[PDB]
Structures are given as C-alpha cells and as structure tokens.
Ligand binder design. Structure first.
Ligand SMILES: [Zn+2]
Ligand SMILES: [Zn+2]
Ligand SMILES: [Zn+2]
Ligand SMILES: [Zn+2]
Ligand SMILES: [Zn+2]
Ligand SMILES: [Zn+2]
Length: 259
C-alpha cells in the first residue's frame, strides 16, 4: 500500500523543452522526445503501465515512436512496467549487466530481498557499459554506473539538443542492508563509495531522480504550473543528493562497525 501511494497518478507535464514527466507521484518516468524517436527512462510498477502509456498519449506522442527504454535498477518500482511498455513500444531496452540478469529473473534472487518482490521478466536488448553513449535526434544518453543500492544501479546523463545537461539519478539508499562482509554483495561498500565520487563530479542543469521526493517533484511542478519556466533547473540538486545520501550511509556504516 506504500507502492499504492507511490503510484498515485499525476497529470503529465513538461520539465523542459523535450523533457516530459509521465510517471506517478513518487515513481519517476521521463520521456525524452526527438524528431527521430523518443527515449523513456524507467517505467514504474506493472500496475501503472497503462497509466504511463496513457500519459504519453495525453501529451501528443505515440508509443510506437519510443525507440529506447532505459532502466535505473531492476526492482519492481522501476522495472515492473517495462515488459508491457516494451511490448506496446517495439522499443529496445537498455540496462547494465546486473540489471539485465535480474530483469530476466523477474526481480527474483535479489541480493537483499530474495524472491519477495517479483515482476514480469524482461529481455534486455542492449547491454549498457559504464560511460556508453547512445545518440538520437540530437540528444545524447550516457550511462553512469552508480552501484550500491543494487549491483547494477545505473544513473543516466542526458545532453539535450539545446546543450543543457540532465542527470537522472538512481537511488543510493541502503535501509536494512548488511554492509560489512555482505555474503550476497561483497563489494557493496566500495561500490557505493565510488558511486558518490562519480555523481559528485558530475555537473548538471536539470536534476532528476527515480523517486520524486528526492528532487522536489511536486514543489517544482506546482511552481512551473504557476509560470516559473525554469523551476526544474537545479544546479545544486545532485551535490545535495549525494551529500545527504553519503551522510546517512556513513552514519549507518559507523553504527554497524561499532558492535
Ligand atoms: Zn530501489
Ligand atoms: Zn525498493
Ligand atoms: Zn525505487
Ligand atoms: Zn552481461
Ligand atoms: Zn546472463
Ligand atoms: Zn528463487
């Protein structure tokens, strides 16, 4: 029922020329539109897939014009709807190796959740490597591997046609994670530390994240509706996101080491 609250619909809107929000109240889904086809970053829950397509069409765009679907990490609140969106799309799915493996499993054998939260399996069509780039209609999409929350967690850097940089950040949360000598994910700590360094060295004009509460979705949305054209321009958003995630992580790790 917390996913129920996260999946409450929002009216789609423009974040920026060529950048559209088509997700829910707290589960992000971003459509990048170009004259050569579109990119969809993340999907949400399987139950929200009809709402996502519905949102895309309410903006005046066609599912058949979506060429790529990118995934941040392969859990149900972001990959759950990809299977059906892929089918309605004909699009090719992009994801890191570890995300591809988990998505083929339907979310099962999660290093922390086991088989607790499955979703429709997906076949990834294009395996993403760190720093790999895709070009479409003047837009560039680049993968930034940011593991920690999951072994394959991926952030996404978009260079828009107008030259401005967008960063779609994956989660860095580790609630309830065993951080010291984790049997199922032994490289977690070094992974998340490299992720902090990678993200904090990234310049950004438009800061987004796969959970709306973490980049002020509802506040920025209301502000833009009232006429603030640049409400989603947030050049300090990623630095603050990393600082607060790192602060919480180091406190959690310090507590785990103080047995
Ligand atoms: Zn997650
Ligand atoms: Zn989760
Ligand atoms: Zn999530
Ligand atoms: Zn692979
Ligand atoms: Zn494999
Ligand atoms: Zn199993």
């Amino acid at each position: 029922s917390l996913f129920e609250a996260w999946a409450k619909p929002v009216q789609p809107f423009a974040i920026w020329p060529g950048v559209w929000y088509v997700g829910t109240e707290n589960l992000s889904s971003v459509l990048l539109t170009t004259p050569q086809g579109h990119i969809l970053i993340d999907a949400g829950l399987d139950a929200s897939a009809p709402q996502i397509r519905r949102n895309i069409e309410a903006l005046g765009f066609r599912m058949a014009d979506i060429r790529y679907i990118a995934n941040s990490h392969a859990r149900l609140d972001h990959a759950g709807g990809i299977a059906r969106l892929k089918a309605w799309s004909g699009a090719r799915v992009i994801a890191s190796h570890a995300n591809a493996e988990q998505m083929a499993r339907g979310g099962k054998e999660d290093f922390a959740l086991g088989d607790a939260l499955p979703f429709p399996p997906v076949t990834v069509d294009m395996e993403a490597q760190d720093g790999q780039q895709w070009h479409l209609g003047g837009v560039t999409l680049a993968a930034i591997f940011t593991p920690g929350h999951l072994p394959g967690a991926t952030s996404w850097k978009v260079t828009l046609a107008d030259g401005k940089t967008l960063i779609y950040a994956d989660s860095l949360a580790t609630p309830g994670y065993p951080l010291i000598n984790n049997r199922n994910y032994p490289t977690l700590v070094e992974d998340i530390r490299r992720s902090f360094a990678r993200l904090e060295a990234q310049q950004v004009d438009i800061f987004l994240a796969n959970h709306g509460e973490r980049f002020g979705l509802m506040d920025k949305m209301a502000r833009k509706a009232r006429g603030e054209n640049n409400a989603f321009i947030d050049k300090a958003g990623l630095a603050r996101y990393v600082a607060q995630s790192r602060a919480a992580f180091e406190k959690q790790l310090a507590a785990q080491r103080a047995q």
